[PDB]
Amino acid sequence: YEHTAVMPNKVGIPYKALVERPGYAPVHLQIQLVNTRIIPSTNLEYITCKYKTKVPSPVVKCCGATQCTSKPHPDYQCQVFSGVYPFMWGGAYCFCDTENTQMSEAYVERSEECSIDHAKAYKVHTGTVQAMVNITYGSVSWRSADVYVNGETPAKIGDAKLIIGPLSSAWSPFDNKVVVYGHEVYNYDFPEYGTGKAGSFGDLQSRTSTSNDLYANTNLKLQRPQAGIVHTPFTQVPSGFERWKKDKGAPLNDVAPFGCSIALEPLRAENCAVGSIPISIDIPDAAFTRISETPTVSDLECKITECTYAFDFGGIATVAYKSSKAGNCPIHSPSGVAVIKENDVTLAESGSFTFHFSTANIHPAFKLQVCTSAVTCKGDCKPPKDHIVDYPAQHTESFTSAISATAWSWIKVLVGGTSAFIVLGLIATAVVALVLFFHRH
Amino acid sequence: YEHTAVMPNKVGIPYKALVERPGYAPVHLQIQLVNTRIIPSTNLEYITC
Amino acid sequence: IATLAPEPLVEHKHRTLILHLHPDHPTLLTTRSLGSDANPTRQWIERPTTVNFTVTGEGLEYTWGNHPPKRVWAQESGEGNPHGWPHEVVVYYYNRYPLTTIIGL
Numbered sequence A: 001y002e003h004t005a006v007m008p009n010k011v012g013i014p015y016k017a018l019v020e021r022p023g024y025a026p027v028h029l030q031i032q033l034v035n036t037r038i039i040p041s042t043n044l045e046y047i048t049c050k051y052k053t054k055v056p057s058p059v060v061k062c063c064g065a066t067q068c069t070s071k072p073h074p075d076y077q078c079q080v081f082s083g084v085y086p087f088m089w090g091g092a093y094c095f096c097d098t099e100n101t102q103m104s105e106a107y108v109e110r111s112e113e114c115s116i117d118h119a120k121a122y123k124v125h126t127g128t129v130q131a132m133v134n135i136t137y138g139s140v141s142w143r144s145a146d147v148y149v150n151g152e153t154p155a156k157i158g159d160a161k162l163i164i165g166p167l168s169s170a171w172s173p174f175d176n177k178v179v180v181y182g183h184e185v186y187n188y189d190f191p192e193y194g195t196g197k198a199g200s201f202g203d204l205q206s207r208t209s210t211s212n213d214l215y216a217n218t219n220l221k222l223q224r225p226q227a228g229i230v231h232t233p234f235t236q237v238p239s240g241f242e243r244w245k246k247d248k249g250a251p252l253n254d255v256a257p258f259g260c261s262i263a264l265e266p267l268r269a270e271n272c273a274v275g276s277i278p279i280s281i282d283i284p285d286a287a288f289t290r291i292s293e294t295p296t297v298s299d300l301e302c303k304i305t306e307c308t309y310a311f312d313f314g315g316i317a318t319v320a321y322k323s324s325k326a327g328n329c330p331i332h333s334p335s336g337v338a339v340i341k342e343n344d345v346t347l348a349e350s351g352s353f354t355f356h357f358s359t360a361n362i363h364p365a366f367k368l369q370v371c372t373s374a375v376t377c378k379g380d381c382k383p384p385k386d387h388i389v390d391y392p393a394q395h396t397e398s399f400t401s402a403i404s405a406t407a408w409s410w411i412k413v414l415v416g417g418t419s420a421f422i423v424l425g426l427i428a429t430a431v432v433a434l435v436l437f438f439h440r441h
Numbered sequence B: 001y002e003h004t005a006v007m008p009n010k011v012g013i014p015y016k017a018l019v020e021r022p023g024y025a026p027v028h029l030q031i032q033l034v035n036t037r038i039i040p041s042t043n044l045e046y047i048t049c
Numbered sequence C: 001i002a003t004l005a006p007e008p009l010v011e012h013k014h015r016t017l018i019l020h021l022h023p024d025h026p027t028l029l030t031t032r033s034l035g036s037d038a039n040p041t042r043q044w045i046e047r048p049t050t051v052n053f054t055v056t057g058e059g060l061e062y063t064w065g066n067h068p069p070k071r072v073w074a075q076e077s078g079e080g081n082p083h084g085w086p087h088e089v090v091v092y093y094y095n096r097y098p099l100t101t102i103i104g105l
Helices: A240-246 A405-410 A417-440 C086-096
Strands: A002-008 A014-021 A024-048 A051-054 A107-110 A119-137 A143-148 A155-157 A160-164 A177-181 A184-187 A204-206 A214-216 A276-282 A297-306 A315-323 A338-340 A352-359 A367-370 A374-376 B015-019 B027-031 C009-013 C016-021 C027-032 C041-045 C049-053 C060-064 C070-074
Touching (some): A107 A204, A143 A155, C016 C027
Antiparallel strands (some): A002 A276, A024 A204, A051 A107, A160 A276, A177 A184, A297 A315, A315 A352, A338 A352, A367 A374, C009 C016, C027 C060, C060 C070
């Protein structure tokens, strides 16, 4: 039998519902979420790491000149310095005074630390949503399996078949372009593999972690050797990967709203709480019993002994029944004023039991069913002494839930007696026209 | 649980109260005084004989 | 292996969380709210200070140093009596609803 309703998108709290079938006793249905993962689609664009500029050995032409060719290398540089006359150990290097050549070639290559700490530049495309759902009904225990959040994939959980409907909102915490460094992600823009400002983020881009091709602009410039010694001096701006690692903002896992914990290896956004989830579960007829088998109850009167405004289950009430025979029947409340802690009851012949509930109202006028029979409960509640708790609310706060009976009588005369006084004022005009008409004829 | 009240300044008469924690049974509380000493601070000036 | 900061002294108020932080090293404190608006704050603490954060019913999550994050939710304790004279009925709803009592009156 198909049960169709709307479940709010929360993880900790369960969803309680009583399934009504004509000619059959109702059953208790519990749906509880464990995980809620939003998994977008990503393609890796490029990686970034600190560079390492390695220079080859320069040549020392004694009496002559040298030229260079445009070798294929990232950020390759060449120059020619004329008239160097270098000095080494054991006297001078060459004969020809005030005419000599030094090569001083340099180019840029990635570091050996690029395989350990590198930033992965991802482009985010919208994808699929999945969840893990705990299911029980009737008398069988809790058992769970992974489900898909769409409108086309039923999942076989238990003896029933469950279709978890799509999310009400398409909100995702990820941007179009993200950067993954270590175990945290960031919302950052890219130089898009073509550009690079040589000191901010894209001074060294490689397509994969072991790609042969490498883009690198770093403002590398050759400098003249001085006073006749053999070395190749260069000048370049510092790395952009180090400058990004200092001038960095907060990661997305410290920034994302709705309590979205972010994992890494499929790049999920776990346990967000936004929107609602429609449900459709088809419970088989093997868990349905008849009206003749279940007992009937009567003479139900309810008294609330203690209620509290606080979170968790701060209310406790005892009810009195008169059952036809012993057995088990579920209890459930349709209205959202009070949730119920437990599902079933061990009934007896003319006894009484207590149950625990949870409201967000001063005066709960909630109503619950026991053994497909009706009873109502009324009472009063007191504010709690706790200021801050470490657990979320089990109830749902409404708009009229904060109105006390003293203030409700105060606003029943400012809108009731005043608006009816204008009615008293308006009928005086309606009767003075009748008297003035009767003066004529 | 914190329970604040006002007791009188009588020595032999105990103060009986009933604390009320919600969701729990009330606990009886009895406070009694056995002494009451006011000790001023003194500095000796001189002796005489 | 990294240092662990001493735990803060936590005292509660009405929709207000107070932390007494006493660091011996420059320590990072990041807070965020679990509602629609995250409102993220971050600062480095080098001296013994005290900070107040407005915790609502949706919640608040704060991390201090290398400690795991903690989540706290504010209850509805209130500062008034809802039944009685209207000089104390109004002051009960002013603390609970300061945005509707001024407009509604």
